[PDB]
Design a protein around this ligand. Structure first.
Ligand SMILES: CC(=O)O[C@H]1C(=O)[C@@]2(C)[C@H]([C@H](OC(=O)c3ccccc3)[C@]3(O)C[C@H](OC(=O)[C@H](O)[C@@H](NC(=O)c4ccccc4)c4ccccc4)C(C)=C1C3(C)C)[C@]1(OC(C)=O)CO[C@@H]1C[C@@H]2O
Ligand SMILES: Nc1nc2c(ncn2[C@@H]2O[C@H](COP(=O)(O)OP(=O)(O)OP(=O)(O)O)[C@@H](O)[C@H]2O)c(=O)[nH]1
Ligand SMILES: Nc1nc2c(ncn2[C@@H]2O[C@H](COP(=O)(O)OP(=O)(O)OP(=O)(O)O)[C@@H](O)[C@H]2O)c(=O)[nH]1
Ligand SMILES: Nc1nc2c(ncn2[C@@H]2O[C@H](COP(=O)(O)OP(=O)(O)O)[C@@H](O)[C@H]2O)c(=O)[nH]1
Ligand SMILES: Nc1nc2c(ncn2[C@@H]2O[C@H](COP(=O)(O)OP(=O)(O)O)[C@@H](O)[C@H]2O)c(=O)[nH]1
Ligand SMILES: [Mg+2]
Ligand SMILES: [Mg+2]
Lengths: 432, 107, 430, 432, 430
């Protein structure tokens, strides 16, 4: 009676979606065929026969990565009307994923979401998995967040945006494909979770002792975080928190709604020994600078509204005991106007392991979702990567030729520059 | 007295090759009357891509241009030229000294 | 889907095509007959990008062969992998090459052009989603410069929204095999920066030294130089027809590369380039497959990368490797080559990784440079045009076909900007 | 409820700590695995599973000696993040353990100590094992005692310095490295115990009859002395003495805090017969001129504040009897201002023999500590070994080239010369 | 970690190294191919100091082989352990040796200097913690004195904060195999006190008397002289690549040793040196492996240690022994020889003990002295300069390449202080 659905726009959302839907079948005994040997109705509109198809719409412009799904192990799971493909990709071009080619199949996408809201009576929210890199994942979501607010408007719309790193970038027009996706979705997003590609490599290197992490392994860490946010629907816990409740505790203004996730503990199999990982210990591992999955220095700002999503055998006294240590500490300075900014959710499931993953089986976990202040310097970075590449008019001739104007680039920067004034608007102290 | 640790990094990491040959031959004769001053540091555009921007001395005075004088607070990191691998090596220091030779500014 | 047409023109192009469709057809496991014998089923999942299924389970290449004499077309037909082609494609003339740009574009190019395009149209109606037109010519000769720079201006008249990518062989600095190649080049550069998208400018002079130093051969035949070019040629499109962990195609390798609509002249590269006996000394790891790439000895275009700077840099890999080893090494070399990149382009390493290595190796790297290092390629050619135009030597053949004296200054006026802009966009800062 | 961590800076500190942590696992039945078939909470932050990891931080710059630990018998024992290595050693150079390499990994060390004291509610003291020889053992300690006096300040900070021998020295800049590390640690050390190599070679020859003593065998004697100081926490006796109770009895003036250890009886296995070793016999063996573990003549001075730490089956009547025999003797002269200067502790544990060691199993032991007078004549030794190498200015060109001023060498000598005056300030008779 | 580069220059240097890498290969158990066959796993724990692992579990040396003619490099490549090296390292020239400091530094040293250092730069990028640079040359010739004294003045331009330890065979008093070796050494002494850190002055003269009296041979070939030198050359570094009790390394063998930044000329030593049959008469104990050392017959540098005194005397012991027996003997020989040490250096013995003896022994001693005994090495050489400069004979060859008559007086003025400083700090008391 509470059903959330998921959309997989681009490729970086689709291969993360291969890590999510593999993982849900382990937490419920679901086969890849949909067979199983009662609260899993939040993701699976079932059939009168034995099969549990998922609630997922895989839209893609190029037919490349979808054919790995149509031929892989989870071929039999999905309904083959969900698996929507096309002919030519946007190819890192906002004007080929929002104006030219993305205009074509948009009436096959929304009409497919139309036939999934009728299998639901308690429709809950949206899960668009995408990235800010390409012009498909950040050029078609910007089209599609406009459309699902025309359809509903009053439903929660959660993204999981894979963030462009300050160290490593595998594109060239990537600071053009991020300023354009802000302006289009900022008036119709709900709460976009930032996850960085860079910071997972350090967590795979130091805390896990993996020197060769593949894209198979950077998505296992984003699999458990998405499994932790939606852990309160599929299971009964001590203090549950539904998806409609995230938009009020975490979003202080109609602009600042960019939380960065953080999972803990992350340990190797050999280091499951040698330590005990108490809730008073693993909570201090949340607020380290060395464990944040978006590369900033969190001791260079504040914290407007944190949020802790515990799970496993966790004592709610020791939660209060571990938190009362934290607000007494020195380095972790919250915001003056926020009195005390936590929203703690204790659930009754251990963090389940996937076979083949290099994560130890621990008895408890936490997915901190910290709306910090200091990430605006990382928003200040992707304007300095805009200004130097726009005074020389570099790479503009691909956008102009496919339906995009010159007037809409210094426009959205000033809109982004208005979003950068708002974080220093937070950092003031309105005294007396 | 670290003339060798900076001239090696002038023509291998910051201004190397045939492109800026006219540029780095300027900054040899500029410091010829200098280097009796003990230490000299450079400014670096970014810790990821080290490009040369300004040449300093340690007395912080610019001779070939950013700011004419620096403070300790606007310094991002303190980098050490790894001679064995022609790269940068970060430090835990916040003050100056014999160890530091490469500084990066903030914004 | 995403079908590509492969047109061949000139003698130099038509002997890569005997080797290219041997480079390709050994990856997909294609016999000299035209059938399939490979083991993996990943090959036939994307066989239709270059092929057509015929009756009996046979696959034939989508290639269209153009010449002005039946000389070299008889060699490719009589050669191995020659009977794989569709025999209607072989469109050839009678008057010979002429080694003459004024003949292959104004005299013989004006007769056989419509008998080419109707076979092109027959090959394009059999394709659902047309991608682009990879064309194999060379700037040196007269067949592949008069006819090869005509199909640019005729097929883009028919297909104005596809990708046009030529695979050209550029004249060398030291040795010259044509006396009028300072006239065949400048008449073609005028036609390339009109209606193309990219051009993999490959030299011969740097291609010999790699066969001497790095490959360590003794007698390099053209069967071992085109063996090295066509190895690089398949690596560009191998992410368009095989599953990769980070996908690229012939538009992602078009938008990410080209910063301005004229500066689109590339320079390839490849790794590993072992020796026959020195394949037991170097470790085959991603930090070793990159340090071989960013040295100047590996650049097949005969210029120095340390002269001039880079604008955008691609690095298409193959094989099965890990994305941290890639992303560490793409950071690591940009530290130690920081002065060789340009300032107003940050994060200037485009990177893609496929998952199918070449048949027999373990991993391989295809480099796609784009630099201001090729400013003294055009400075070299447009000077050889200058001294040969003062005394107006060799002019009584092009003028004899009816070509005007101003048009040679017109094409020289076009290259006058293009030399300046690699200087103009070098020291322009912000 | 009481915890005392142990840090092993250097190499000579660590190789003793290879023999120390061998002994505690004998005194508690612990395997090298951390398995075992409320007395051991002082050295084992135990896990809820079966493993008792020690509270140890092994830090050294050169990665040679630590790889013996990571491959030895006690591989599985330690928490592997504790074992901290580096690349280039200090190599007997003070300006490479405090200015060049010591600044590199000081933040991996202190943050690792930071994650140990949070597992401690009753934190008691420090045990920094370091020798005065190298520029790691006396250049990284002097950096580290500055830093841990910033974090804690009030806590007790015990060290164990392997003294430079008066006739035998296996280094050339060793009379430099003692004056350097004194000046830095004298304002922040607590009670620095001097143990000499040369006297342990004497005891291995005469009282043990071993003609080939290896560093396997010169560390078993220091392993018993370190164990008997920390024997009152781990056990329970008729009169116990905690580690904070050392620094008040033993340090009269805040400069003179350099006592020398002495263990007794040290007998061979064949000499366990032929004698009786009574509680009034072994205490006369404590105050011999021969049986002291620093090669000095104790009859060339006085005794400011002795200490006796017995263990085993000891009756407190005869302790009062054997002490009363001692102050009536001729040669032993206490200082005139100290009325009676003893501080006696009795435990209920015999000293445990280690297999392979050539020490005989006895019923009782004594770990004599004595803040004596005449050790400053051996401090006068390490300035005549300084003045002859500072006048001709030898070896200075390695210090100056690695971040070290010239003015900090006659400065620290005068501070060492001020330490020489205070012992002669003690020995006077302030009459009337 | 702590990798070491092993550059080889000159004919004398390139024939020790062919024997030197035969020594290192037998302590770690290395075949001629490159694989592993040893029994102990302690050998591979620090294998990465001289080696780079290649594919298939094969180790190759980190050696860079510099030459001016292809003569001697043909002998090493055709000889055994020739195929262990990497075939890109063999950097050689064409114009012969020359036996000429004006040719190995001004004529052929000007061209082949960057073909060396680019291979040096390729070896250093494959190293994590770069330790130092051991160079195998000889003061006598003209390849190992012009080219070998150029690389120090180019690598310290590139690596100013490392250690540069050269292994120089020094000319003998009686026999002289070069007439102008009094010109070769005094031009090389000018280039080692500038930019080195230590220099093992090994002679030929005293090396035969060890091979005649102590070893009791009849016909000493160079295959047995360099057999004896390389046994010392591997002993200095075995406290870095094997676990020891009281450790030492190349920087601990720098700060302990060198009192002043110019007096860094060391003299080697080794024990035991048995006869073939007289190994059954002498006891193999540490008090016998010390009295063999501190006598003058064991010194490989041909000078009398009793003339002049010592400054810092280190003695790296090896094998399984006990530290009391060590420190008893290092005290005993300082009591009985106290007049041969200097007054103002107290406690003047550095001592190291490792645990892996050579294959077949039980314990071994490597002695690294330092003395004022080599005032009459420089009193010998600088006078042979002097009588060959009053008439200024042999000058019309070095001047012929462009060298000035003051530059010979500059290098002679450099040695004029260095003779005085072993006299200035000899009787300086306090
Ligand atoms: C059956 C047996 O034990 O034979 C011994 C042996 O009899 C004696 C006589 C050897 C032998 O040495 C000689 O005959 C000799 C000849 C010319 C020059 C120098 C030595 C031996 O050849 C040498 C050899 O030494 C080694 O193997 C060391 O590892 C040595 N290796 C080499 O020198 C070497 C020789 C050939 C090829 C490659 C390496 C070494 C020493 C220091 C550092 C590294 C390596 C040894 C113990 C033996 C023999 C075989 C007879 C002695 O020498 C050494 C260096 O060990 C000479 O006095 C010692 C005492 C040894 O007992
Ligand atoms: N988390 C995650 N990110 C990935 C993976 N593969 C690629 N990426 C990221 O994807 C980003 C590029 O955007 P993509 O989504 O792959 O591209 P696209 O949306 O399909 O658009 P085009 O490729 O231009 O058609 C880069 O920043 C990569 O870091 C993966 O397996 N997991
Ligand atoms: N008691 C004892 N002393 C030792 C032992 N090993 C070495 N030493 C002493 O250590 C002193 C040398 O200092 P070290 O601590 O070993 O050197 P270091 O501080 O590690 O620094 P490096 O010089 O870089 O190795 C000498 O006086 C030795 O007697 C040992 O096992 N036991
Ligand atoms: N790489 C390569 N270059 C070739 C080959 N054949 C000819 N060329 C080059 O092509 C140029 C001559 O042009 P060519 O194509 O034969 O003349 P055309 O037939 O009139 O186009 C010269 O620079 C030749 O070096 C070949 O097989 N491989
Ligand atoms: N110990 C030793 N000395 C050698 C050897 N070969 C040559 N020498 C000495 O090297 C000197 C001649 O120098 P050489 O290196 O051959 O000349 P270069 O090639 O110009 O450097 C003479 O003193 C020779 O005795 C050898 O194998 N061993
Ligand atoms: Mg895509
Ligand atoms: Mg040490």
């Amino acid at each position: 009676m509470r059903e959330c659905i998921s959309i997989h726009v681009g490729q970086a959302g689709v291969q993360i979606g291969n890590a999510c839907w593999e993982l849900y079948c382990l937490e419920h005994g679901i086969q890849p065929d949909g067979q199983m040997p009662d609260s899993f109705n939040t993701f699976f509109s079932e059939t009168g026969a034995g099969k549990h198809v998922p609630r997922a719409v895989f839209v893609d412009l190029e037919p490349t990565v979808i054919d790995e799904v149509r031929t892989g192990t989870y071929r039999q799971l999905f309904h083959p009307e969900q698996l929507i493909t096309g002919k030519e990709d946007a190819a890192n071009n906002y004007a080929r994923g929002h104006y030219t080619i993305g205009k074509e199949i948009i009436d096959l996408v929304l009409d497919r979401i139309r036939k999934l809201a009728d299998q639901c009576t308690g429709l809950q929210g949206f899960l668009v998995f995408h990235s800010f890199g390409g012009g498909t994942g950040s050029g078609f979501t910007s089209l599609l967040m406009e459309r699902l607010s025309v359809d509903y408007g009053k439903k929660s719309k959660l993204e999981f945006s894979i963030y462009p790193a300050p160290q490593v970038s595998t594109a060239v027009v990537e600071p053009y494909n991020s300023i354009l996706t802000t302006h289009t979705t900022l008036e119709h997003s709900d709460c976009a979770f930032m996850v960085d590609n860079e910071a997972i490599y350090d967590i795979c290197r130091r805390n896990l002792d993996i020197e060769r992490p593949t894209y198979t392994n950077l998505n296992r860490l984003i699999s458990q975080i998405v499994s932790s946010i939606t852990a309160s629907l599929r299971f009964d816990g001590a203090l549950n928190v539904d998806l409609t409740e995230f938009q009020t505790n975490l979003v202080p203004y109609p602009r600042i709604h960019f939380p960065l996730a953080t999972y803990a503990p992350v340990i190797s199999a050999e280091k499951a020994y040698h330590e005990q990982l108490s809730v008073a210990e693993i909570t201090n591992a949340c607020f380290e600078p060395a464990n944040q999955m978006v590369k900033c220095d969190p001791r260079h700002g504040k914290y407007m509204a944190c949020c802790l999503l515990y799970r496993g055998d966790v004592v709610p006294k020791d939660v209060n005991a571990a938190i009362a240590t934290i607000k007494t500490k020195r380095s972790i300075q919250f915001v003056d106007w926020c009195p005390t900014g936590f929203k703690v959710g204790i659930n009754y499931q251990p963090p389940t392991v996937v076979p083949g993953g290099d994560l130890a089986k621990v008895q408890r976990a936490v997915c901190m979702l910290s709306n910090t202040t200091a990430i605006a310097e990382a928003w200040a970075r992707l304007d300095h990567k805009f200004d130097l590449m726009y005074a020389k008019r570099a790479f503009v001739h691909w956008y102009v030729g496919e339906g995009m104007e010159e007037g809409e680039f210094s426009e959205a920067r000033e809109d982004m520059a208005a979003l950068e004034k708002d974080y220093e608007e937070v950092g003031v102290d309105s005294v007396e | 007295t670290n003339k060798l640790l900076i001239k090696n990094a002038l023509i291998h990491l910051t201004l190397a090759g045939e492109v800026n040959k006219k540029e780095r031959e300027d900054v040899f004769e500029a410091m010829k009357e200098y280097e009796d001053t003990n230490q000299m540091i450079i400014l670096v555009r970014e810790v990821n891509v080290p490009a040369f921007r300004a040449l300093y001395v340690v007395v912080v005075k610019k001779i070939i241009g950013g700011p004419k004088f620096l403070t300790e607070d606007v310094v991002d990191v303190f980098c050490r030229y790894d001679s064995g691998g022609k790269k940068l090596s970060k430090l835990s220091s916040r003050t100056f000294g014999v160890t530091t030779d490469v500084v990066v500014l903030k914004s | 889907m995403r079908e590509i047409v492969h047109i061949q023109a000139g003698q130099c192009g038509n002997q890569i095509g005997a080797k290219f469709w041997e480079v390709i057809s050994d990856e997909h496991g294609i016999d000299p007959t035209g059938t399939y014998h490979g083991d993996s089923d990943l090959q036939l999942d994307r066989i239709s990008v270059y092929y057509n299924e015929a009756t009996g389970g046979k696959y034939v290449p989508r290639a269209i062969l153009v010449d002005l004499e039946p000389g070299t077309m008889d060699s490719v037909r009589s050669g191995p992998f020659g009977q794989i082609f569709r025999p209607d494609n072989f469109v050839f003339g009678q008057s010979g090459a002429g080694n003459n740009w004024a003949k292959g574009h104004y005299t013989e190019g004006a007769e056989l052009v419509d008998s080419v395009l109707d076979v092109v149209r027959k090959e394009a109606e059999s394709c659902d989603c047309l991608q682009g037109f990879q064309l194999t010519h060379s700037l040196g000769g007269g067949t592949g410069s008069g006819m090869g720079t005509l199909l640019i201006s005729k097929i883009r008249e028919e297909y104005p929204d596809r990708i046009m990518n030529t695979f050209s062989v550029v004249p060398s600095p030291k040795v010259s095999d044509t006396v009028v190649e300072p006239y065949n080049a400048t008449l073609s550069v005028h036609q390339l920066v009109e209606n193309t998208d990219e051009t993999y400018c490959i030299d011969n002079e740097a291609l010999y030294d790699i066969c001497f130093r790095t490959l360590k051969l003794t007698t390099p035949t053209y069967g071992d130089l085109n063996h090295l070019v066509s190895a690089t040629m398949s690596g560009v499109t191998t992410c368009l027809r095989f599953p990769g962990q980070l996908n690229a195609d012939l538009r992602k390798l078009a938008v990410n590369m080209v910063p301005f609509p004229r500066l689109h002249f590339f320079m390839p590269g490849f790794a590993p380039l072992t020796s026959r006996g020195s394949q037991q000394y170097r470790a085959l790891t991603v930090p070793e497959l990159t340090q071989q790439v960013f040295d100047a000895k590996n650049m097949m275009a005969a210029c120095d990368p340390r002269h001039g700077r880079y604008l955008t840099v691609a690095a298409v890999f193959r094989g099965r490797m890990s994305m941290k080893e890639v992303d560490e090494q793409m950071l690591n070399v940009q530290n130690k080559n920081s002065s060789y990149f340009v300032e107003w382009i940050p994060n200037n390493v485009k990177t893609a990784v496929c998952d199918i290595p070449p048949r027999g190796l373990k991993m391989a790297v295809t480099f796609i440079g784009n630099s201001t290092a090729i400013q003294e390629l055009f400075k070299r050619i447009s000077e050889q045009f200058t001294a040969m135009f003062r005394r107006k030597a060799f002019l009584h053949w092009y003028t004899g076909e009816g070509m005007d004296e101003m048009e040679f200054t017109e094409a020289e006026s076009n290259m006058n900007d293009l030399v300046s802009e690699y200087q103009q966009y070098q020291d322009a800062t912000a």
